[PDB]
Amino acid sequence: EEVFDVLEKLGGSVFKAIHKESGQVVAIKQVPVESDLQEIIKEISIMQQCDSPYVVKYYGSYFKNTDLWIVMEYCGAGSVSDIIRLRNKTLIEDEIATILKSTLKGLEYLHFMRKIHRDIKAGNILLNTEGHAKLADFGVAGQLTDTAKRNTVIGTPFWMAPEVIQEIGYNCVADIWSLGITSIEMAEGKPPYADIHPMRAIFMIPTNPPPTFRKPELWSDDFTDFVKKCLVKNPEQRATATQLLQHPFIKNAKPVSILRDLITEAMEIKAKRHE
Ligand SMILES: CN1C(=O)c2sccc2N(C)c2nc(Nc3ccc(S(N)(=O)=O)cc3)ncc21
Ligand code: NA
Ligand code: NA
Q: Which residues contact 2 (CB under 8 A, 6 or more apart)?
A: 20
Residue 78 known to bind ligand: no
CA distance 27 to 175: 25
End-of-domain residue from the set 31, 50, 74: 74
CA dist 7 to 17, 19, 73, 130, Å?
5, 11, 15, 22
Q: Do 121 and 205 belong together in one domain?
A: yes
Show which residues are catalytic.
119
Structural domain span for residue 54: 1-74
Residues 83 and 215 grouped into a single domain: yes
Cα 48 to Cα 101: distance, rounded to the nearest angstrom = 23
Q: Within 13 Å of residue 180, how many CA atoms lie on the same side as its CB?
A: 26
> Burial letters for 135-164: b for 16+ Cβ neighbours within 10 Å, e otherwise?
bbbbbbbbebeeeeebeeeebbbbbbbbbb
**Main-chain dihedrals φ then ψ at residue 274, nearest 5 degrees:** -70, -40
Distances 228 to 59, 127, 219, 224 between C-alpha atoms, Å: 38, 25, 13, 6
10 plus 103 within the same structural domain = no
Do 70 and 82 lie in one domain? The reply is: no
CB 113 within 8 A of CB 155: no
91 is in an annotated binding site: no
Same domain? For 80 and 64 the reply is: no
Instruction: Say whether both 103 and 152 belong to one domain.
Output: yes
Domains contained in the chain, number = 2
- How far from the centroid of its chain's Cα atoms is residue 98's Cα? 15
Question: How many whole angstroms from 7 Cα to the centroid of ligand 1?
Answer: 13
Closest CA to 107 of 215, 241, 16: 241
Strand partners, 60: 71
Tell me, yes or no, whether 103 and 177 share the same domain.
Answer: yes
Which 3 state secondary structure label does DSSP give 111?
A: helix
